[PDB]
Structure formats: structure tokens, C-alpha cells
């Protein structure tokens, strides 16, 4: 069964504009510019009005599998809007039983070094994705603050940090040490 037409409309706030070059979405907000293309999905994108800036995603004659792509595109567009308007701040808490985790935020927050993870002499060097800034929270003793515009890049850096401190050859249920994402939040809280 091919559904004749499946569409969903995403509203754009007044402080941010979106420009389309075919299926390449250019989103320029106050926090910066995010650009992402969708050439791998054969859908129709159009801007509706000059008043409220409605964006519609259209797919004509789609089977069950490709109909799921419309809302995926809509969610990605909303994530880009949220990033360029409010931004993405991920809070990760480092937990430990005996050995405290020493975290060094190197130049511009692009490099993170972990010293005493489980007391081993190795040093973990994790480089953040470009455009993502990592920092140590000034309000908490063990908290890492990751800030950036693109949700995928920020969460990818967070996943790299989380997987970097991985216990090996031990019962991970008992040995719960490592750095783990506490919450996924925003910047500027607006």
C-alpha cells in the first residue's frame, strides 16, 4: 500500500530563518548557523508563508518504510531550530567508588583528559567534535558541561567520553565507575 500523501508542518520562530537549496536546509539562528542536507531521502521540502514561516515535509506515494522518514526529518529540523535558538547543553556526572576521576579540560575545551579512572596509569585523550565546547561545572564537584549547537555532535562527544571510561574484565554491575550523562538540557533556558 502506497499512501498518496503524508505531510507534517513544523513552525519556525520569528527570531530564526530557514533557507532551502533543494533538500539542503540552512538554519541561521542567533546562536549560529546549522546546515544539514537530506539528499538521501526523496521528499519534497517547501516554505509556506512570509508571515509565520511554516515548513512542510511532503512524501508522495510512499510505502510503510519511507513514511517514517517524514517525521524523522521534522524532528531533525526541530532539533536544529532548538540548537540555533537555545543550544544543547549535556551534563555528565563522573561517579567512582575509590579512585576519583581527574578531568583536565585542555585547549578551548576541545580535548578532555582523564587521569585516575580506576587508578590505572593510562591517560584517556578524547577530542571533542568541532563546534562542541566541554567544560568543568563550577557548581558541582564532579560534572562535565558540554555545550554546542548541533545535537548530534554534542551527544556524540558525550558518548565518546562515556565509552572512554569503560570498565573491562570486571563485573560492571558491581564496578559502576565512569562518566555518564546525567541530563540532556539546553543553554539560556529560553
Amino acid at each position: 500500500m502506497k499512501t498518496i500523501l503524508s505531510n507534517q508542518t513544523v513552525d519556525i520562530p520569528e527570531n530564526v530563518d530557514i533557507t532551502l537549496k533543494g533538500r539542503t536546509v540552512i538554519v541561521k539562528g542567533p546562536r549560529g548557523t546549522l546546515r544539514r542536507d537530506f539528499n538521501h531521502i526523496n521528499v519534497e521540502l517547501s516554505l509556506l508563508g512570509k508571515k509565520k514561516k511554516r515548513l512542510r515535509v511532503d512524501k508522495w506515494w510512499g510505502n510503510r518504510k519511507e513514511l517514517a522518514t517524514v517525521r524523522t526529518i521534522c524532528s531533525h529540523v526541530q532539533n536544529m531550530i532548538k540548537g540555533v535558538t537555545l543550544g544543547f547543553r549535556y551534563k555528565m556526572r563522573s561517579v567512582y567508588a575509590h579512585f576519583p576521576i581527574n578531568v583536565v579540560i585542555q585547549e578551548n575545551g576541545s580535548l578532555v583528559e582523564i587521569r585516575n579512572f580506576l587508578g590505572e596509569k593510562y591517560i584517556r585523550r578524547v577530542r571533542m567534535r568541532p563546534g562542541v565546547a566541554c567544560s568543568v561545572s563550577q557548581a558541582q564537584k564532579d560534572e562535565l558541561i558540554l555545550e554546542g549547537n548541533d545535537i548530534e555532535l554534542v551527544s556524540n562527544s558525550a558518548a565518546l567520553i562515556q565509552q572512554a571510561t569503560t570498565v573491562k574484565n570486571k563485573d560492571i554491575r558491581k564496578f559502576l565507575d565512569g562518566i555518564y550523562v546525567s541530563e540532556k538540557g539546553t543553554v539560556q533556558q529560553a
Binding site: 500500500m1 499512501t3 498518496i4 526523496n42 508522495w60 506515494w61
Partner: protein, 175 residues
Amino acid sequence: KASGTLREYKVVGRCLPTPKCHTPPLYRMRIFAPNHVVAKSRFWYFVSQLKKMKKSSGEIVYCGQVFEKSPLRVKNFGIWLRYDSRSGTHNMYREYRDLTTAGAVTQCYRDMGARHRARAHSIQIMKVEEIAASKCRRPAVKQFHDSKIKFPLPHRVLRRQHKPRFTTKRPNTFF
């Protein structure tokens, strides 16, 4: 039974008269066959299954094609049938949109063969009827109930791929 473009047949037959009933009752059936000979054969098969009749034991008194009474009108067809799958017999109800009843039956045959590997000899069509748009239950058919239907032809595949076989310009599929 092979296929083609099927045709409706109003087949009327009866038993041979006997010195027990001089006027055996007549029976009328609608049979969709590529030709009238296959229509007669399927009529004999169906009357043998339902009543206690044989082709030799009886006769066929009428066999004519049933033309569509409104082939210029789009209409919804509801079809009841049974078929023998690889693991038994099941009953189905399917819906189609076509101008002709016979074309709708042919569409049903092709669809059953495509979806369930059902060969034509295994399928017993038991009821064909035009239905209103309100009585349709299959969403693939119901979605065509639009007084303002509108859709483009998104990605048109080039069909004249060999005239020319060699060319300088890459084809355009946007129209």
C-alpha cells in the same frame, strides 16, 4: 485454467429430462473465463460441487457474455472468494477499483497470484458485487475517495531507453 482478459458469462444449464421429473430446474451462474468453453467447463465443475450434476448427466442451455452496464463509471467492487493455500483453504474479502466487473475479477486474480502465490486453479470466486464508497473497508481503496484528489508524478522512469541507445545528455526525470 490459464488467464488473459477475463469475461463475465451468464451460464444457464440443467439436467437432462428424466421420466421422474420432465422439467428439471434451471440454474444460472456468473463465470469469469478467458473464453466461453472454459466458462462452460467451470460451470459444470461448480454445479457438480454444489448440486448433484454432471456434464454428461445434464446440458447447458445458454452461454453469453455479460457486458458491463456502466463501463464509463468508476466504481468499487467487493469480492468474496476462497482459495486453497499450501496449507489449507481460507476465505478472503478483497476490494478493487475498476470500470469493468471482468477487469476487476482479473485484477483480483493477478493480485492473489502476486501476494499469495495462488494459481488460478486454486481460487474459487464466490461473490462479486459493486459497493458504495461508504462500505469499502480496505484503506488502499478508500484513499481514492477524494473529490479534490491531487498528486504529482514524482520520479518518472525513462522508458525509451534504446531510442537512442547512445546519447550525450543524461535524461531528466523531473516533470
